[PDB]
Amino acid sequence: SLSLIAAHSHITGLGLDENLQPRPTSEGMVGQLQARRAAGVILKMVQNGTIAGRAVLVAGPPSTGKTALAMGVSQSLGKDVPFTAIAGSEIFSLELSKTEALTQAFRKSIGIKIKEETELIEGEVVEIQIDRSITGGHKQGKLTIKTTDMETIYELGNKMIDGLTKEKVLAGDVISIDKASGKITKLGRSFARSRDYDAMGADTRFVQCPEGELQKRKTVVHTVSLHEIDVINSRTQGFLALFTGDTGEIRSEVRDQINTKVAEWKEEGKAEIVPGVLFIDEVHMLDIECFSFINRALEDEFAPIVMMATNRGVSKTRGTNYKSPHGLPLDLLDRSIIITTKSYNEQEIKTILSIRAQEEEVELSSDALDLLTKTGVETSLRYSSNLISVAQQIAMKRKNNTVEVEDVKRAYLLFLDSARSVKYVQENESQYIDDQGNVQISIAK
Amino acid sequence: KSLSLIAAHSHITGLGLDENLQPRPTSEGMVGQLQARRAAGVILKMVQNGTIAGRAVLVAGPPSTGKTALAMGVSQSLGKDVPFTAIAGSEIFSLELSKTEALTQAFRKSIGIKIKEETELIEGEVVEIQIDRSITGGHKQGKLTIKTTDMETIYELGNKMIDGLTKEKVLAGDVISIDKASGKITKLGRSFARSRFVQCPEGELQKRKTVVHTVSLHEIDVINSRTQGFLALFTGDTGEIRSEVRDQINTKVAEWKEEGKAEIVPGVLFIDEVHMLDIECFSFINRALEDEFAPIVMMATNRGVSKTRGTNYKSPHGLPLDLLDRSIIITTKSYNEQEIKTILSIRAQEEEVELSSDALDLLTKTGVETSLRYSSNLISVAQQIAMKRKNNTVEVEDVKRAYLLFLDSARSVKYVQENESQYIDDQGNVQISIAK
Amino acid sequence: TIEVLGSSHVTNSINNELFDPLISQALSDIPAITQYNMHVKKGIPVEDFPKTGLFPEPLNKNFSSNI
Amino acid sequence: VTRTAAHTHIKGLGLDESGVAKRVEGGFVGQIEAREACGVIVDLIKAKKMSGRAILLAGGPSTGKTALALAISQELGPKVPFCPLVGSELYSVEVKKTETLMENFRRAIGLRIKETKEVYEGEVTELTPEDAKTISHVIVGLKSAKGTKTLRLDPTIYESIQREKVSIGDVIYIEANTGAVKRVGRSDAYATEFDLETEEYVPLPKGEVHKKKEIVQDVTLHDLDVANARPQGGQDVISMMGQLLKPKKTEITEKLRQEVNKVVAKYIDQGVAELIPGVLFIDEVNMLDIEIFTYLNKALESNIAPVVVLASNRGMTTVRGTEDVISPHGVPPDLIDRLLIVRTLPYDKDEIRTIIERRATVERLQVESSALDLLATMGTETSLRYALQLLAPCGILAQTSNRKEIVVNDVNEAKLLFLDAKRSTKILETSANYL
Amino acid sequence: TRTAAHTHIKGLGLDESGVAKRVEGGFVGQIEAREACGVIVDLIKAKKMSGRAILLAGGPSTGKTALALAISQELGPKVPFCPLVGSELYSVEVKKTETLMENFRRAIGLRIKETKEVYEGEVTELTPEDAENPLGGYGKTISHVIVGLKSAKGTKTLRLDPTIYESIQREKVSIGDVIYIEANTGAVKRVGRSDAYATEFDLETEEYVPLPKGEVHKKKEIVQDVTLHDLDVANARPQGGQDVISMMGQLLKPKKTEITEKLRQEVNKVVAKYIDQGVAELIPGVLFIDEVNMLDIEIFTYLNKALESNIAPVVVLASNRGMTTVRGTEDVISPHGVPPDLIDRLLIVRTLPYDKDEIRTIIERRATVERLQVESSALDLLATMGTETSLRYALQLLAPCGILAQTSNRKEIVVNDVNEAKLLFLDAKRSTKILETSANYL
């Protein structure tokens, strides 16, 4: 697969009951009962879908579980619901305004759901017979398609003849034709003719011969966010702008016609509206203009639920020269509700370390787990989390499979935390370059 | 080739040294500065040996004391076929390229690949061309009687040679060179036939010549990147060449070097006024100096304990101490009266100016009083003042008239400080009126 | 002009890039008697012609040349 | 012959099977604990299981941080990707710095692909196409010095054959898997049809017509990202002239990254592809802005992020982009909490002498012992780097007087010509007009 | 049904020829500002003046944006209304002056009417009739083209030009398809195929529009509503052309450009020429800018220039600052972040804060819009909560109360649910007290 063991991959959903009551340890989350209950309330707000434009703020000290709670919300949200998780530094672009980047991030988080039916005729072409009239204005086509089980004869129109003359099939290629829409594709060449032409070439590919029933019926569901429609209706060939990001400040008229037409599509009954969540991690470093645009853009009907995370105290706001709580102005803090996380104790740190050791497939002893719990009490939690992973390798170099206290002590001595590094820098300040660019290179005076 | 009127360092043809790298008192247009010239000769031997890479040399001293002259002497004594990239400090603050990308291009412009190849040519003198053509132009027949001063021959020509001779019309009496593989025909001119003008070639018609190509690494980087062609070598919009094609070129160059198909020549990258670079440029140079494909970087500066750009503290020579740890420093000194007189005599012989002896003593006195460059600039104005009164030799009063007409720095500062009420100060206050 | 001594492939590729027949046909037009020879005398339909006449019109007759 | 530039005496970490460092081994002198920690990190990277792990190694200047990073890259081998970077390279004028950081993050994850090369090459002796205005197939006959071989070809390759202007008697090159057709030129058997021709004449190939070869392709994830994110479109195989409108870099969306990940995850399960994570090394990390420092926290939490190795030589220093954030090593405390710090200690006199002797050995110079003591004393007095960079002028000055060996007088002469930073500062202070 | 912070207000709620009543149209209180906004609405409906500016000022959570949206609802949907934020003018493609001028021209509308004479329906016959004396060296010289059309309850045979048959051949018009011919231009277009010719082939791509209703020939009067900015961006960009530049720019990124004053002058003079003909009506509208303190003094200076124009619409500005420095200046102290040059050119409407009964009534209306049922004692405790902390905090704490009531399988909010929502979700003041009384980087 293409996923390694991430920072928090043990979190699979939010560990709640049916009455929104959090279990002490379930679904990878340990502790934080009030924050998990509030996140369950916000999850029920998203799943209800009748409300729009609400702002919560997860405030706490570092290494407490704000982005862990956001990951739990994203995992318990389920599929086909848009969840757009960005950081604070992503909106500063050189060819897009901050307002336009925030508009695209807002409209990436609300989608529409469209159901459609497919009647597929997928098979290998045997023989195409083209009949031309004397006048030549109308043409007929005898198509011989086949599977491994049955084959039949189909009648074609002139538009079939034109569409098969383009991307021309050579009597032994695998195609698939739709009946309701007339979609035409060339999947490739069969493996029965793989030893025919002695050199394949540039623009060919080999597929298996399709088997089973030749006719198939399938209902498929598509979820398209409003940003995709905004990009597509802005150019001639717009999917290249969807995959390359060169959209470049899409205008407002196309946005309001897309809003009007999606309201008309909801009223007709073709499509339905799926609201989602926009998560902004480390929200404290946005400009004051972005905050102005945010608290004006939270008042629209086509607005998702915005989850913002920060860990600053009373700090200055970028773009101004004064300090504010959480690095956010009071106008934005008026239109918000705050979930506050609390620091852990010995038992919760021990349980989180046990879960992270189980997830990384690392076996520990009781004494090593107690020593790592004491280290995570004194130092932070992520230091012990990294200490587990390096102590596993130190264990495996000894031809031993379980991590002992000697390995934890060796990993503690080899790698330093913040406080010991600060002490060693401050005791030996002459050997480092200070703020004025002074350094004693030589060891002799 | 290489048109040039007169430069400020055009009298310098190289470092004046013996076989033991000892400096002569006066050789190849360079006088004085014995230790600096010896150190630059050792640096020249470093470049000529080519077995070491990524060594940084700093040339620091007072202004107008032989720094750019030393760099020009090193570049002249290097000779041709060895890359030498001389840039200024303000040339990398671009609008379409980042500073690190411009520095990377300036670094990779100074390492060359030497490739020897052989090609065969037909250089001769056309005696007679016979062309047989049809009505519709289907089949063409051609006879070509062509010769040198040594042989004579007749060639049957195919259809594509007929087309290549009709285009770029070759007549009898011409001297042409034909490449058989590519079909490129070049008219060298007309022969000596009064009945331009070149000499009829000698020897064999079909010659085989070996040519040597020196291609910089930046040229192969531009060519191998498929998004732009070779015209970006001339138009200049290379535009942030990626590192993957740099890795491919760095592997393929060593692959050619191991197989013996090509050779490595290193060059010199000279950065004049290095103190105008930013701190992010120095941090890039600190890691770019440790590559195998890194030239020898010579930097020239004249600042002393100034502010490093991009920071708020002061550093020696305008450079941070981690960069200065990675460098060895050549220091220049101020000039005496005799060396100033010799430099002014050399500049007098360079600009075809005839000088009297007492005028030379006056120029030396006003050179050790004010500046070397001021006396080096007066010496051509005084020649025009001499030619106004119709005599060839510049006399004393000819120097005095130019001294009276054209001012220097100190007299201008004195007159400005005397009459500062008539000029615009820092605060923007001026007085234009004369009365009251 | 880029020259490589001792190879005809570079000359063929350079002559293909400088005088690409699709683009050079797009920036010009077919003569009328030639078009009559293609369509009527040779049976080639109209839609099978190469695309021609994509050059933008100048402002005047005086603005069409530097001479 | 051989080029030495401040390195290449470093061959590795010089550890044994139990991971304990030898004193002088692999070109490394001293520095036991940092080498052991780097060996543990190398083993963790070779375990190929964890994503987003980070390491910062800190110490004074001229202590061995970049040498340890290069020793890690040499210990991993050339198969594992390794992306070196400086902190000033993240500031570009075409895209934002976060896009450059994400591109350098995805440049360190590689894929190994098993591929086959099949080549036909020889003289064209028969070129017969057959239809059923539309050709059906072409029979091409090839001949080399070991014999002939006939092939059938599709009209697609026939169009490229006709585009290459291939006639009877030309030596061609056909790749079976890709369909690429290359023309070499006419043969020497047809060199006498005219006295003068524009065609180049090549001899017949000596080997067989059919050649098969097993090859291994290494492709990073950024290559697959940039192969699909071309804004102008695809390019031809051969193009000496560039496109008329300049294609610049663009902010690649995450949808393309997800689809590339889907394709790679499909290809891995069939056994065609093998995934190899690598190392992103960033030297001089104190040049990073606070916005890049914030985006690094999000980028380290992804599922495919490689192992990042940082280095810094600062003390308690204000973070760039901020006013009053004093933090160790110029790194904000948010990122330091996700880091593991390895300390680097300075050297004593005997290790400086051993390093000078080791560098003099690899530069093929012979130094007298009394000159080596003077060089060690100079290295302790001013700098180790100043003593290391004065070896080549000493060699040149010894070669000047026809000697293959360094004497003390050469060291004194090279000290007289070239100055260090301290004596330059002393000349700077007691000067009149700008030195 | 989606509710988002608004849509409980339906206009201002004034009566005719008089003043605002106490509660009407979703508004509680704010009588004088509602009367002033109604006077401004009547002035806009008078359709005479140009470039009048209204700045409405007050504290946070007072109702400035609600008053602007009430003005927009009171005008109706046919009058243009351009909402804007002061941070939107900073673009990295074009200068902010051009963005302000584009948003100025977006707020003026043109109503045009036209008559179309069409012939549409399924083709019955298509015969190019030959001439009596054909010319030599040619083939099938055509004198006219006979086309028969069929629709719902009407068939009619036509007699056409010789020229249109070329367009019939280029548009690939066969028998049985549905065509559309306007009178003065010709220009037959193929709208599709009839549904009676759908099931003779198993596979096809062409769509099947059914037979059109009404007669084959009917003159229809259409009415189209555009803006001046649409005309500017339509005349500035080229039409469908055969040059390579037009097709190359259509496949590239639509980069915004500096529209010249000459194009605007030509557009205004041709619009005035067609207005004087009696065909076009000009409808000025409202340009609304929220949080105008984000503008710097350059945009303020260009606003001073552009408000004295001949065509400029009514601009409504909103701000909530007091004595504040203007952005882009270091020492200019100004009310509401607006320089005195612009302050002298507008009229200021002051908005006042609320009291406890108005807070309770607003909470009652926002509860009855969100389809919620609140107990009376819980309503009084929520009104006390809104008095103590904020009106917006009391409004935003309604949906967690409804969710917690639903989780206990009840349909009514009680005191315990609002206490649980108090304990779960914090406000700004208690979070600030938590930040101040902690020293762990909180």
Ligand SMILES: Nc1ncnc2c1ncn2[C@@H]1O[C@H](COP(=O)(O)OP(=O)(O)O)[C@@H](O)[C@H]1O
């Ligand atoms: N309740 C929890 N259960 C399990 N793991 C947790 C919990 N809270 C925090 N963690 C772990 O702590 C690590 C760092 O915490 P993080 O979520 O980054 O806090 P913050 O976002 O405040 O920095 C994460 O890898 C996460 O797995």
Ligand SMILES: Nc1ncnc2c1ncn2[C@@H]1O[C@H](COP(=O)(O)OP(=O)(O)O)[C@@H](O)[C@H]1O
């Ligand atoms: N040793 C020398 N021999 C000849 N000319 C010299 C010498 N030193 C200096 N000059 C002259 O003095 C002038 C100043 O030299 P230069 O090094 O360019 O100034 P700076 O030291 O400010 O860079 C030059 O024009 C050069 O011709």
Ligand SMILES: Nc1ncnc2c1ncn2[C@@H]1O[C@H](COP(=O)(O)OP(=O)(O)O)[C@@H](O)[C@H]1O
């Ligand atoms: N333990 C060691 N053994 C041998 N050479 C060393 C050792 N440590 C450092 N060096 C040499 O000293 C120099 C220090 O350079 P570098 O490590 O890049 O400086 P910094 O640590 O400031 O980045 C390198 O050229 C390296 O070859």
Ligand SMILES: Nc1ncnc2c1ncn2[C@@H]1O[C@H](COP(=O)(O)OP(=O)(O)O)[C@@H](O)[C@H]1O
């Ligand atoms: N007079 C009023 N009647 C009913 N609701 C009001 C009134 N004034 C304000 N509100 C409500 O207060 C909320 C916020 O007010 P808002 O218009 O944002 O004030 P401001 O624009 O000054 O911040 C809106 O959702 C609105 O519904």
